[model samples]
Target: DAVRVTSSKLVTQPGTSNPKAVVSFYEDFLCPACGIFERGFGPTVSKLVDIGAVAADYTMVAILDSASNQHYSSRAAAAAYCVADESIEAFRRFHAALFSKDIQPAELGKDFPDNARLIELAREAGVVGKVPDCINSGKYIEKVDGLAAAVNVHATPTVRVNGTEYEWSTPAALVAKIKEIVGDVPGIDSAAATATS
Candidate 1:
C-alpha cells in the first residue's frame, strides 16, 4: 500500500513514489541495540538507496522513558520525524548519528545532551532549518507513539523487509536477503532491473 502524508506522499523514505523494495525499521530512540543496529545496517541501507534498489522508512517509537529522566525517547523520536518532515535525507543521517552517539540505555533521554543537542545533531546532518523549536515542543510525540501501537512493536530495531518480518542481523545478511528477494539491484548488480533502472 502507498502512504500519503502531506508533502511526504510516499510509503518509503526520500519520497520515492514506488520502490521495488521497502525496508522498514521500527526503532526506539533510547534503545541501546537500536544504536548498534544503526551502525551495523545503516551503511547498507544507504548503499541500497544510492543504487535506487530500495526505500527505507523509519518508524520511531518511544518506549524507553523508564531509561531516561526527560523522556529522551519521545523527544528524540519527535525531533527525528520533524527532521524527516523537513528532509528525509537529513533524517537518514541524523537517525544514524543519534544512535551512534555514546548514549547508554540507562542515561538514554534525560538531558544526556538535551534538546539543544538534537538541533546541533540535525545541523551537522545537513538539515536546512531551526530544529530546536520543533524538538522542544514535542510536535510529533503522538505520531511516534502511534507507530509502535499501529504495528504492536515489542522490541527495538524490529525490522520488516517488504511488509514481512525480517530476521537477518548483519549488513551482509541484509544485503544477501535483499538479493534473494529482488535479485540484483540496478546500479548495484548486473541483474539491474525494475523501477530502480
Candidate 2:
C-alpha cells in the first residue's frame, strides 16, 4: 500500500537551538501573498534566526496545485522535501530562491515551473546531491497532500507566533510582535528593528 499516513513530517527549522519565540508559516510556493510575506519579512526572520533569538518553522503546503498548469505547488513543495532530505544545508537557500520575487509564479495565469525547472533551481541554490530523481518521481507529493489535510489552515501565508495566530499588517508590525514574544535581546532586537526599514 502507498504510505497514506497523515503525519508526513513537513516542518523545517532554520535555527538550531530553541528560542523564546517560534514563528511558523503555513505557506504555499505558488501563492502571491506567501511570496510577498516572505520577501517583506524573510530577511528579518533570517537575522533573528541567525542570532538564535527566534526559530523559523516552515510547513510547505500545496493547496494551489490546480491553480497552475502543471501542479507546480506540489512539485515545488516536493522538490523542497528532496532538498531537505538530501542536502539540508541548502534547504533554506532553495526555499528562499523559490520564493524570490524573480522566481515565484503568479496564481492562475503565469506558467508554473515544472519539475525539471525546479531541479535546476535547486542546483543553483547549491543542492549538490541527487534531488532530481526525488523531485521527478514525486517522492513527497503524498506527504504534501497529507500535510494539507492534517493542518487546519485555509489559506497560504498563515502566520503563527509561539503557536498563536498572528495577523500581521506590516513588516514592522511583525517584527514588533516577534520582539515582544522574545522579549529583548541586545543586538538582535536592534537588528530586527533596523531590518524593518
Candidate 3:
C-alpha cells in the first residue's frame, strides 16, 4: 500500500502564505541574554534561512514593567513587527542591531525615544518608509501579546521549533537540536529539494 501525500493550499506560515516549519521566538529587547543570543546565534539562523532550512516568527513578551524600563519592550516589539511587515530580512537585521551594543539599565532609560529611534534605524536598513505608520497603528502588538499569552512565555529568548518547546540553554545546544529535527528524511528531503530549486 502506498501513502497518498496531497499538498493542500490550506497549509501556510503563521503570518504568511508560504508553508514552512515555524520557529517561534518569544523575546524581550531589554534582556541581556536576548542581546547575547541575537548577536551570537543570529548568524547560524541566517545561514539556515539562506539555505531554506527554516522560517522564523517573532513574539514580543514584555516583562520589564518597572518605571525605569518603561516602554522598551512595547516599543521594541512594535518596531520588530513594523520591520517584519516591511521585510523579513530587514526585520532580522534590525533585531540584531537592537542588541548589538551593551544594553544597560541607565542606557535604557524611560525617555530614550526607542520607538522613534527604531523607525529611523529601520529606514536606514532599507525598510519601507511607512514603518512609522505601521508601528503606530499597533497592527501586530495584539498578535505578539496573544502569542506570548498562549505560549505562557514569561522569559526572553524562549523558542519553539515546530510547536515543540526547546530549552536551548546555549547556542551549541540549539544547533544540535536544529540538526536533529532537520535531518534528511529521504522522501521529504527530496521533495523539498525539488520544490525549492
Candidate 4:
C-alpha cells in the first residue's frame, strides 16, 4: 500500500508553495536530538523558506509522549497544529520558541508545559487567535499516529529531501544538497543562516 501525505492535522508547510525543492522533517518536539537539529539548522532552512527557495514541510510526530509525565509530546504537537491551522507564521514562532533552551523540558522529567502554559506560550509566540480547547484534548494524536506510520517514520528528526530520506550530518552539507538540487537559489542570504544561533 502506498503512503498518503495528505493530512490537515499532522503536516504544516512553512515555505513557498512552488518552491524549487521540498524539504521535509519528521520530528518530535520532545526529542532532544530534534531540539539540537532545530537549533542548529532550523535557521538555514527557515531562511530558504522565506526566500521561496525551498518548501519546508514539517511532520510533527508525538513519538516521545512518554518523555514526560503529562504526555508533553502529544499535547505540544496538538498545540502546534492549533497554531499552524490558524497561521503558519505564528506556528513558526511557536515552533522556534518551543525548542529554545529555556522552554524545552527534560525527558522523563515531571515538569513540562501544561496545556495552559502552552496556550500562554502560543500567545507570546505571536498567536493572535484564540487558543482552542483542542490543544489540551489531544485532538490530533490519532491522526498523528496514522500519519507517522504512513510516512514510515521510525525515528525522530528524520529528514527527507524531495521525498527521499536524507541522513543529516552538518548544516553545510544539507544546504549544499539543496543548492545542488535547486541549481541556483537566488536571494539566499548566508548572513542570516550563519548569524542565527
Candidate 5:
C-alpha cells in the first residue's frame, strides 16, 4: 500500500515542505521505550526538524498491557494531537511532558481532568488555550490510526525513515543509521547530523 501522508496541523519548518525522507513513528504514550527515545534522541531530532533536515510524523497506537494504561495512552494521544492544533512547538512540549514520569497514569484517569491539564501544559508551552475542545471532539484519531494501518504497525515505538524500518539496539545506533540514509543532503547542520547520527 502506498503511504498516505497527512499534513500536521502543527507548523513545521520550511525544509520539511518537501522532505527527501520521512520518519514515521508509531508510539504508545505508556511505553518506556518511547520515553527513552523522547529523552535520548528527541532534542536532536527536534533541532533537525527546526532546521528542515527531516520531516517527522507521529502516530499513536495502543500496545501497553495494563488496562488502566489505556486511559493514559489514549488520552495522551488525543491530547498530543490536540496540541498540534495549537502549534508544532506546543506539540513538542506536550510530547515531552507525556514522557516526564511526573504525569503518571493515575493522574490522568478517566475522571481526571485530562483536557484541562493538557491545556495548562500547552499554555506553559505558549500555545493558545483551545486544545481542550479539540480533544473533546476526538478529531485526530482517524489520522493516527490511518498512519498505523498504513505501516502495519501493531507495536509501539516502531520507527521508519525513508520507507525503511530501522534496526538498532540503541539510540546512538539508530542515529548512525539515520545519518547513513541522510548522506550528503546539502545544508545539513551539526544539529541535524547529531539528530540522525
Candidate 6:
C-alpha cells in the first residue's frame, strides 16, 4: 500500500523499509539548499539504512519548473520517477550523485544535463533498461507536474522525523536528532516519537 500510494504521488524513497525511524523529505534537485541538506543529512540516513534502522522518503518535487522554458526541474524529477520505478536502490545512488557536486547558480533549468546524462547516471546506479527511454521521452513531465499540486510542500528540503519536523544546521545535530527519534528499540516508532517530542 505504501509503494502504491507513493507511486501514485510520484515520490522517491530511499533507505530502510518499515524500520525504526521514518524521515519524510521534501526536496527539489535544483535547490541549492537541498544540496546542502543532502551533504549534511544523506550519509546519516545512508548508514541507518545499511543497518535497517530507518526509512527516508524523499518527495521529488519540481518546484521551479515554470520559471524555465526548458523545464529542467520537471524533467529531472521525471527522470527520477523513472529510476525509482526501476530500482529504488539505484535511485538511492542517483540521489546522492545529484547532490554530490557543486552546481553553479548559472546552471538552472534546461541547462541541466540532458536525458543522455541522466541515463548515464542511472547506469552508474545499475539500472539496465527501460529507464533511459522513460527519461528520454519526458513521458512523465505532466505526471511530475501534476504531482506537485497533490502534496502539501511549499518549501524545498522540508524534512519531518516521526511526524515532528526539526531544523538542523549540521549532520551531527541531525544524526543526534534521528537517534533520539529512533530511541532504544525497533518498531516502537510511536513510543519513541512521544519520548523524543
**Top of the candidates by lDDT:** 2
Put down candidate 3 lDDT per residue, 146-182, tens digits, no spaces: 5556668887778888778877665555555555666
> What are the lDDT figures for the candidates, one per model?
0.68, 0.74, 0.61, 0.73, 0.62, 0.65
TM-score of 5: 0.72
Q: Candidate 2: RMSD over Cα atoms?
A: 6.0
lDDT of 4 by residue, 134-166 (tens): 675667767665666777887988998888889
Badly placed stretches (over 4 Å) of model 1 are 1-16, 103-111, 128-130, 189-197
User: What would the per-residue lDDT of candidate 2 be over residues 1-197, giving only the tens digit for each residue?
Assistant: 01111112212234533346777788889889888888888777766666656667788887887743578888888888788776554777888888998999878765778888999998987885779989877889888867777877768889888789888777667777766766665556666575667
Candidate 2 matches the true fold with a TM-score of 0.85
In the range 135-196, model 6's lDDT, one tens digit per residue, is: 88887788767665767677887877766776756655555666675554343343233333
Q: After superposing candidate 4, which stretches have Cα over 4 Å from the reference?
A: 1-17, 128-130, 189-197
Clash count list over all predictions: 1, 0, 0, 0, 3, 0
Clashing pairs in 2: none
The Cα error of candidate 6 at residue 73, in Å, is: 1.0
Between the candidate structures 4 and 5, which one is better when assessed by lDDT?
Answer: 4
Pitting candidate 1 against candidate 5, the one with the higher lDDT is 1
Which candidate number would show the highest TM-score if scored against the true structure? 2
Superposition error at 146 for model 1 (Å): 2.9
Model 5 C-alpha lDDT per residue in residues 93-187, reported as the tens digit of each score: 77777776676344335533355676677777677667767766766655554544566788767878776886546545554555565654444
Q: Write the per-residue lDDT of candidate 1 for residues 1-197, one digit (tens) a residue.
A: 11211213222334545655787888886787887778767666677666656677678887765443576787788888878777767887787788875643444333565778888888888985747777877777777766677778878878888889888557766776667766664544522232122
